Enzyme design. Structure first.
Site, short mmCIF file in Angstrom:
data_model
loop_
_atom_site.label_atom_id
_atom_site.label_comp_id
_atom_site.label_asym_id
_atom_site.label_seq_id
_atom_site.Cartn_x
_atom_site.Cartn_y
_atom_site.Cartn_z
N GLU A 71 47.04 27.37 100.56
CA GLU A 71 46.89 28.53 101.42
C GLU A 71 45.43 28.75 101.82
OE1 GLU A 71 46.81 32.37 99.48
OE2 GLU A 71 47.67 31.59 97.73
N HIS A 100 51.95 39.09 103.37
CA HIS A 100 51.72 38.74 101.98
C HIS A 100 52.87 37.92 101.43
CE1 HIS A 100 48.22 41.45 101.25
NE2 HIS A 100 47.95 40.43 100.46
#
EC number: 3.1.27.-
Length: 108
Positions: A71, A100
């Site tokens: 990520e 998120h």
């Protein structure tokens, strides 16, 4: 400068690495980043968190043997980290989340 979904996506698929403005969570922390203080921009001017492996223990992202997911924070400039993340695999598949890690969409 390179911290947008398109700028980072196109850089990953071309350069096969995150731009120079990304540092891992551990590197940020060693430089003095304290998540609860939202001080990243103070202790590491111009950097965003990125490069850490994403577990993907929930099976939301596509799986494959020897596939690793990583990520990187997107749209970060200052303060607390936002909720925008780019997810990229070893074979350069690119997913986005803006909530998120709850939901992802393919962008490349």
């Amino acid at each position: 400068v390179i911290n947008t979904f398109d700028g980072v996506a196109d850089y990953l698929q071309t350069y096969h690495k995150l731009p120079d403005n990304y540092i891992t969570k551990s590197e940020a922390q060693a430089l003095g980043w304290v998540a609860s203080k939202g001080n990243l921009a103070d202790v590491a001017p111009g950097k965003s968190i990125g490069g850490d492996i994403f577990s993907n223990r929930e099976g939301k992202l596509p799986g494959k043997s020897g596939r690793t997911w990583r990520e990187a924070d997107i749209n970060y400039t200052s303060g607390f980290r936002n909720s925008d993340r780019i997810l990229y695999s070893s074979n350069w598949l690119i997913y986005k989340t803006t909530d998120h890690y709850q939901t992802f969409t393919k962008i490349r």
